[PDB]
Amino acid sequence: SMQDPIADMLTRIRNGQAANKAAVTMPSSKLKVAIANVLKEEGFIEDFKVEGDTKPELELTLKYFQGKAVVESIQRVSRPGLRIYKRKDELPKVMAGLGIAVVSTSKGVMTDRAARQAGLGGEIICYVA
Amino acid sequence: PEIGEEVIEIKAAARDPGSRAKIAVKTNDKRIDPVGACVGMRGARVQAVSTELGGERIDIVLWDDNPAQFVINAMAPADVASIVVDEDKHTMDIAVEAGNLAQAIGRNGQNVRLASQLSGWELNVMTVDDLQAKHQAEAHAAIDTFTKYLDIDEDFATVLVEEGFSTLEELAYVPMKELLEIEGLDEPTVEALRERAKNALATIAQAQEESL
Amino acid sequence: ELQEKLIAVNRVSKTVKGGRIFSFTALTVVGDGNGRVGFGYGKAREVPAAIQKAMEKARRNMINVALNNGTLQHPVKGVHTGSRVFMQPASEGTGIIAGGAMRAVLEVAGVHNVLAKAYGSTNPINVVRATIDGLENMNSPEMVAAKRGKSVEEIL
Amino acid sequence: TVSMRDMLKAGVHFGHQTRYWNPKMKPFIFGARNKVHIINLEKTVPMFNEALAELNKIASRKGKILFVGTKRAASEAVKDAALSCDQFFVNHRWLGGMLTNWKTVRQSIKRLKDLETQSQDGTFDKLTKKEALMRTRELEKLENSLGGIKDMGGLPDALFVIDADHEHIAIKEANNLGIPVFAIVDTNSDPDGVDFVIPGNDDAIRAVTLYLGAVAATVREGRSQ
Amino acid sequence: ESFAQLFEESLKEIETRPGSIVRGVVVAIDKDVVLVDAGLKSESAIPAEQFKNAQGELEIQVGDEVDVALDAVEDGFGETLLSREKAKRHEAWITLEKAYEDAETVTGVINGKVKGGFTVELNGIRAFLPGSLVDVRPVRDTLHLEGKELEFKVIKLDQKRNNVVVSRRAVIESEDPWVAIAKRYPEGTKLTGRVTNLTDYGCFVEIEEGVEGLVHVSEMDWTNKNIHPSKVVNVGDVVEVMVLDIDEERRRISLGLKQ
RNA sequence: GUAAAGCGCACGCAGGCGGUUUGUUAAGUCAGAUGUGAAAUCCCCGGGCUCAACCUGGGAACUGCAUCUGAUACUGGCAAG
RNA sequence: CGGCCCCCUGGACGAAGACUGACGCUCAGGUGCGAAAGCGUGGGGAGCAAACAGGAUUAGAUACCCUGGUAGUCCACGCCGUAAACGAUGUCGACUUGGAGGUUGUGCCCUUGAGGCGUGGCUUCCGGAGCUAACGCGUUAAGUCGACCGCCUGGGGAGUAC
């Protein structure tokens, strides 16, 4: 059964990048939306678009720089089987700071740097590079 | 042997036998490295030509692409930073610093001729400051010419030539929409001021009629 | 200017009607002490000829690597067939902490400071290939900025 | 330069069947007519123009062009095209490693040249018959194989090809060496190795001729420049 | 723009599948291959034997136009099924024209009954007939001057199997294959059938409304085993064959050619 | 899959995991504080034995536990969809 | 699991709608089904055939071959619980280029004809990216991921002893 929506998102994105798909669509969720927004802010994607009322569909638009994809790597870290929660000091650095780590915090979902700046940790969703 | 089996693209060989012999070479991007093959293990083959016909300062430059990269490569072995261009006689104006000019110029009558035939035309070694000096000696002149072009009032002309790049000398062929962004652009009049400059050119041709 | 290291040389056999024909394989690697690196794997009936071939091949099929000053830009993994390799940027003075073929390639590459372990197989050929792969994929800050449409200070 | 109507007349828009296509060509396909793929001329034309411009630029800097077609339908035409602009060509079977293994083939060229000289300039006749027949046969072989590229000297600076899938060996060689590739690529073909792809009917004779003629004209222009 | 889309549907509108629109201009002749271009993906490898008329020499130079046939695409490279079949549609149209006025008038010269019925030939092709049709009455053209010239007056046609029998004389006078498969049966009814594919043990001549015949390898000639059918007859040609044997059950009508 | 390693196949309790929206809670989670976490040991900056080991001042650390005050994105609970 | 028929009976798929409203996935223990051989009791017994007997072959022939031939194979009700019980590939879900078929639905289309254009289910082969020690797998993954379980830790001794 479908158990982890976010991870499914990330896999879809990965597969689109692999296959040189322009855009990747999937059912929408708020957490998914926020993640997409974070990615866009962090520039791994061009734009995201949710559409629909009863069952809305998130549609991300993937990014390709000099042929190859932008999202070099994208992994979940927290997962239903095994959750990961980090305190602000302990927060990670993806690719020695070049990549990002999406982290959900009390004040919303943000990149690891942003969280560090804020002064708070939380659940580590995914690394992106 | 790579050059012999068409692996080291060797165009011209602008070199002065009996002194310095610097020459650039191109190659089909395939992990070949042209200069490297010409040099060898610690200048293995380089030493051969060094003591071949006589003590010569042979040099190899990694040709990049087109003639623009040939300019810098012709200034080697030294440190080029920038260069000017033109039409038929572009005259590569070498732009380096006094400190690095000592080696770049090397000898008054040696590296100034060896690097002159490098591109096939001729080079004009200059200085970083020299470039700027001549650079400004050009902004004032599309203006530094008794202003024989458009002409209207002078108080507006100063404020227009402040923002104006390359004065107005034949600037109508450029973007005719960025001067309308200037604070003060009602009906097409500045787009008309440039037309006046065009008329001034015709007036200059009429002056040629006055002299021919 | 280029420096060249023969990593290994190995005798390999071919059985024929008469008996065993022996030959020699030479694994070399070359580099300019900067980003640029290339390995070559030559074969000949005699050893010196085989290493000569290895050098020739290495000199061609060279690859560039984006080095932050003496070390790497971030931890990087690279694999090839059995040899799976981890290598990690390190502070000036630490030197090349790496084993075997891997070491050699790093030195010619002109990296001076790394912490580096070869998991899995340590078959010199495969492990050097894996190293090269890890070095190639490694991107720089400017590169990622360009990829992503940002400035370097935005990425830090 | 080359108009769309002319291409349509030639039969460029036609492309291979629907069981023989390549999904990397899906962009370049427009539709499928009578279970036959149609190439999108709207997307073909601009790129063809581009490719022409690049070829012209190459010519301007005194670039060496190699014209490859071994389809044996358009071998005559490719040779004609090469000659019109006095460039080089391989209208018969491409020798495996012609470019990569140039140095060996260069000897081959030299032997061919020597044989030609013997035939023509020497005027020595008086050769043992069988031996003379053998030398003649060798000459014919070498002319067929390396006739166009004999005056080439080194390695070309660009590579025009009539079929990518058919000449994939040449393409691969060009890629290994880094020579620019200008390929006519039908729906069945693989354009990944190609630098300046050209979606067009490699098979049809008139279309091939048209492709060649425009290429030759732009080479001549660049030479004039 | 939609220029191209409109053109695509235009060019759809101005071609059809079968060999109907005489469009292919002969753009290269050499012996033994003619080639055309009917606005198809490729040029047809035409035989010379589709295009020589009734005495053995060619008739069309460069630029000449005949339609070919379609609905089969790309055996690996190329385009068509041959154009004489197109001529068969014109012959069918001429035969149908009879219906209008109840009399199709041509020349028809029927010397001898292949399979009971005199063979009647229209200009290039020769068709086979059922017995009654050669003669309106018991007149029997065996006493007429050999290969005589009258006309063809249609007595019988099979309407799915191209067997058409016509009346040469007497100007004044004016599932489906397998249930009733007893028409060409009795022992020896000969037929005019085009061969389709020679499978190295066979030839597969099969013409008579969706059946299959095999003249396989043993008869074919008057040599048994060293024969290799491709050498000895043809590809795609109408020949002498007769039944010799029928299965109505395991649908193997085993024709012969040594007759 | 072939190197050791997918139960012969199913159903299914306990257990593990759980679509989507809103509200609420605040258990998990995070932040801050307080209490404690003996001294010695380890590490940092110092000092004293001629140096060192050794001795030694101050810090840091002791990743934890308990409480109180917040945060509520996520996980959980409860209520409605 | 294979001749037809009838009776009782489980599942699958498609077509539209209508409803319920997360009721789901996985599963240690547990429970059930589980080829062939084998066991028990009672029936049956044509053919075949472990065992057995004879004839050959052979150095020997406790085999292969031949002639016979009993358990068994068949039925009923119990037990046994294992097989290279194999796709040597756990189950469920999602995503990622293609081609050629088979089978079984179903929508439209002049079925003008065996057809034309789609859209579902199951299924055979080839092959791309990717993966793989390679062989190969390749939208039915051995690719990219998530949930749960089972299992492995050098060869023998040993899947044996207690």
Q: Three-class SS string for E203-227?
A: CCECCCCCCCCCCCCCCCCCCCCCC
Report the half-sphere exposure of B18 (CA within 13 A, side-chain side): 1
Do C79 and C13 sit in the same domain of this protein?
no
CB B79 within 8 A of CB B72: no
3-state SS, residue E1: coil
Q: Which long-range contacts (CB under 8 A, 24 or more apart) does C50-53 make?
A: C50/C9, C50/C23, C50/C24, C50/C25, C50/C26, C51/C6, C51/C9, C51/C26, C53/C26
CA distance B30 to B193: 55
CA distance D211 to D209: 5
Whether residue A96 and residue C156 make contact (CB cut-off 8 A), yes or no, is no
**Count of CB contacts below 8 A, D vs E?**
47
* Single-letter amino acid code for the residue at B200: A
The neighbour count for residue D122, using CB atoms within 10 Å, is: 8
What domain count does chain C have?
2
**Smallest CA–C1' distance to F63, residue:** A90
Residue A47's alpha-carbon distances to A22, A36, A60, E191, in angstroms, are 11, 8, 6, 73
A14 Cβ contact partners less than 8 Å away, ≥ 6 residues apart: A71, A74
Whether residue E41 and residue D42 make contact (CB cut-off 8 A), yes or no, is no
Closest C-alpha among E45, E77, E50 to residue E66: E50
Q: Three-class SS string for A63-98?
A: CEECCEECCCCEEECCECCECCEECHHHCCCHHHHC
CB E42 within 8 A of CB D204: yes
Length of chain A: 129
What domain count does chain A have?
2
Q: Which regions of chain C does DSSP assign to beta strands (E)? A: 3-15, 20-31, 37-44, 76-80, 83-89, 96-97, 114-120
D122 Cβ contact partners less than 8 Å away, ≥ 6 residues apart: none
* H or E stretch covering A62: strand A57-62
User: The tokens of C59 are what?
Assistant: 């000199």
CA distance C10 to D3: 62
Closest C-alpha among E139, E153, E145 to residue E108: E153
Closest C-alpha among E157, E169, E166, E153 to residue E120: E166
The neighbour count for residue C145, using CB atoms within 10 Å, is: 17
Do C109 and C144 sit in the same domain of this protein?
yes
E240 Cβ contact partners less than 8 Å away, ≥ 6 residues apart: E190, E192, E257, E259
* Single-letter amino acid code for the residue at B58: I
CA distance D193 to C76: 29
Which DSSP symbol is given to E228?
-
Give nucleotides in strand F with any atom < 7 A to a protein C-beta: 16-22, 28-32, 70-75
Closest C-alpha among A18, D172, A72 to residue C136: A72
Do C34 and C100 sit in the same domain of this protein?
no
Spell out a b/e string for B81-116, using b for 16 or more CB atoms within 10 Å of the CB, else e: eebbeeeeebebbbbbeeebbeebbbeeeebbbbbb
| Residues forming beta bridges with residue A24, ordered by sequence position | A60
Tell me chain E's radius of gyration from C-alpha atoms: 21
Give distance CA C3 / C1' F55 (Å).
54
Q: Do chains C and A touch (3 or more CB pairs under 8 A)?
A: yes
CA distance D131 to D135: 6
Q: Characterise E28 by phi-psi region: left (phi > 0), alpha (psi -120 to 50), beta (else).
A: beta
Do C69 and C56 sit in the same domain of this protein?
no
User: The tokens of A116 are what?
Assistant: 């560090």
At B154, give phi and psi (nearest 5°): -90, -30
Do C49 and C79 sit in the same domain of this protein?
no
CB E154 within 8 A of CB E174: no
CB D161 within 8 A of CB D186: no
A19 touches strand F (CB under 7 A): no
CA distance E131 to D106: 76
Name the pairing type of β-strands A57-62 and D36-39.
Answer: unpaired
CA distance E128 to E182: 18
Residue B51's alpha-carbon distances to B43, B54, B107, D3, E12, in angstroms, are 12, 5, 21, 60, 76
Give nucleotides in strand G with any atom < 7 A to a protein C-beta: 24-25, 92-100, 114, 117, 128-130, 132-134, 143-148
C1' nearest to CA of A90: which nucleotide?
F63
User: The tokens of A52 are what?
Assistant: 């629909």
Residues of the domain holding D129: 102-146
* Single-letter amino acid code for the residue at B10: I
Q: How far apart are the first and last CA of chain A?
A: 29
CA distance B41 to E126: 85
* Single-letter amino acid code for the residue at E244: L
Alpha carbon E242 to its chain centroid, in Å, reads 16
Whether residue C148 and residue A72 make contact (CB cut-off 8 A), yes or no, is no
User: The tokens of E110 are what?
Assistant: 């029927």
Alpha carbon D52 to its chain centroid, in Å, reads 14
CA distance E221 to B115: 87
User: The tokens of E232 are what?
Assistant: 């000895």
At residue B117's C-alpha, the angle toward residues B115 and B119, to 5°, is: 85
Residue D207's alpha-carbon distances to B28, C126, D11, D210, in angstroms, are 31, 49, 6, 5
Specify the residue for token string 């009733």.
E180
Query: CATH number, domain at D121?
Result: 1.10.287.610
CA distance E236 to E196: 5
User: Exposed, middle or buried, D112 (CB in 10 Å: 0-12/13-18/19+)?
Assistant: buried
Distance from the Cα of E167 to chain D's closest Cα (Å) equals 43
User: Exposed, middle or buried, C20 (CB in 10 Å: 0-12/13-18/19+)?
Assistant: exposed
Whether residue D178 and residue B30 make contact (CB cut-off 8 A), yes or no, is yes
Q: Three-class SS string for chain B?
A: CCCCCCCCECCCCCCCCCCEEEEEEECCCCCCCHHHHHHCCCCHHHHHHHCCCCCCEEEEEECCCCCHHHHHHHHCCCCCCECCCCCCCCCECCEECHHHHHHHHCCCCCHHHHCCCCCCCCECCEEHHHHHHHHHHHHCCCCCCCCCCCCCCHHHHHHHHHHCCCCCCCHHHCCCCCCCCCCCCCCCCHHHHHHHHHHHHHHHHHHHHHHC
Please give the biggest Cα pair distance in chain E: 72
At C71, give phi and psi (nearest 5°): -125, -170
E151 Cβ contact partners less than 8 Å away, ≥ 6 residues apart: E105, E106, E107, E108, E166, E167, E168, E171
Query: CATH number, domain at A92?
Result: 3.30.1490.10
C1' nearest to CA of A75: which nucleotide?
G145
Resolution for the entry shown, Å: 3.4
Do A48 and A93 sit in the same domain of this protein?
no
User: The tokens of E209 are what?
Assistant: 């409304």
CB E82 within 8 A of CB E49: no
User: The tokens of B175 are what?
Assistant: 């973007």
Asked if B9 reaches chain D (Cβ–Cβ under 8 Å), the answer is yes
Length of chain D: 225
CB E45 within 8 A of CB D214: no
Which DSSP symbol is given to E145?
P
Closest C-alpha among D198, D208, D213, D215 to residue D70: D208
User: The tokens of C155 are what?
Assistant: 């990425």
* Residue that is last in its domain, among A24, A47, A69: A69
Residues of the domain holding C68: 64-148
Whether residue B37 and residue C59 make contact (CB cut-off 8 A), yes or no, is yes
CA distance C28 to C47: 12
3-state SS, residue C16: coil
Do C20 and C86 sit in the same domain of this protein?
no
* Single-letter amino acid code for the residue at E60: I
Spell out a b/e string for B156-175, using b for 16 or more CB atoms within 10 Å of the CB, else e: ebeebbeebeebbeebeeee
Residue B12's alpha-carbon distances to B17, B54, C3, E11, in angstroms, are 14, 21, 30, 55
Do C134 and C80 sit in the same domain of this protein?
yes
At residue D8's C-alpha, the angle toward residues D5 and D12, to 5°, is: 135
CA distance B33 to C62: 8
Distance from the Cα of D181 to chain E's closest Cα (Å) equals 25
* Rounded-to-10 torsion of CA B141, B142, B147, B149: 160
CA distance E121 to E76: 37
Closest C-alpha among E3, E82, E86 to residue E45: E82
Tell me chain D's radius of gyration from C-alpha atoms: 19
Asked if C152 reaches chain A (Cβ–Cβ under 8 Å), the answer is no
CA distance E128 to E161: 11
Peptide bond just before C141 cis, omega within 30 deg: no
Residue E102's alpha-carbon distances to E98, E99, E105, E127, E174, in angstroms, are 5, 5, 10, 20, 9
User: The tokens of B137 are what?
Assistant: 């000696």
CA distance B95 to B100: 10
Please give the biggest Cα pair distance in chain A: 42
Which DSSP symbol is given to C33?
S
CA distance E87 to C143: 68
CA distance B7 to A28: 57
Q: How far apart are the first and last CA of chain D?
A: 17
| Residues forming beta bridges with residue E46, ordered by sequence position | E34
Residues of the domain holding A118: 74-128
Whether residue E4 and residue D17 make contact (CB cut-off 8 A), yes or no, is no
Q: Which of D11, D35, D201 sits opposite E73 (nearest CB)?
A: D35
Closest residue on chain D to E35 (Cα): D205
Please give the biggest Cα pair distance in chain D: 65
User: The tokens of B7 are what?
Assistant: 């692996």
Peptide bond just before B88 cis, omega within 30 deg: no
Report the half-sphere exposure of A96 (CA within 13 A, side-chain side): 16
Q: How far apart are the first and last CA of chain C?
A: 34
User: The tokens of C5 are what?
Assistant: 């290291």
CA distance C109 to C112: 9
Closest C-alpha among B27, B4, B24, B6 to residue B14: B24
A4 touches strand F (CB under 7 A): yes
Q: Three-class SS string for chain D?
A: CCCHHHHHHHCCCEEEECCCCCHHHHHHEEEECCCEEEECHHHHHHHHHHHHHHHHHHHHCCCCEEEECCCCCCHHHHHHHHHHCCCEEECCCCCCCCCCCHHHHHHHHHHHHHHHHHHHHHCCCCCCHHHHHHHHHHHHHHHHHHCCCCCCCCCCCEEEECCCCCCHHHHHHHHHHCCCEEEECCCCCCCCCCCEEECCCCCCHHHHHHHHHHHHHHHHHHHHC
3-state SS, residue C49: helix
User: The tokens of C108 are what?
Assistant: 């010619």
Query: CATH number, domain at B183?
Result: 1.10.150.20
Do C68 and C144 sit in the same domain of this protein?
yes
Specify the residue for token string 């855009």.
A23
Query: CATH number, domain at C41?
Result: 3.30.160.20
* H or E stretch covering A45: strand A45-51
User: The tokens of E39 are what?
Assistant: 């606005």
Closest C-alpha among D119, D103, D112 to residue D145: D112
User: Taken in order E159, E161, E162, E168, is the CA torsion positive or negative?
Assistant: negative
Name the pairing type of β-strands C114-120 and C96-97.
Answer: parallel
Which DSSP symbol is given to E174?
-
Spell out a b/e string for E247-258, using b for 16 or more CB atoms within 10 Å of the CB, else e: eeeeeebebbbe
CA distance E198 to B61: 68
Q: Packing angle between helix A5-18 and helix A30-41, nearest 10 degrees?
A: 40
Length of chain B: 212
Closest C-alpha among A108, A110, A116, A115 to residue A128: A110
CA distance B132 to A45: 43
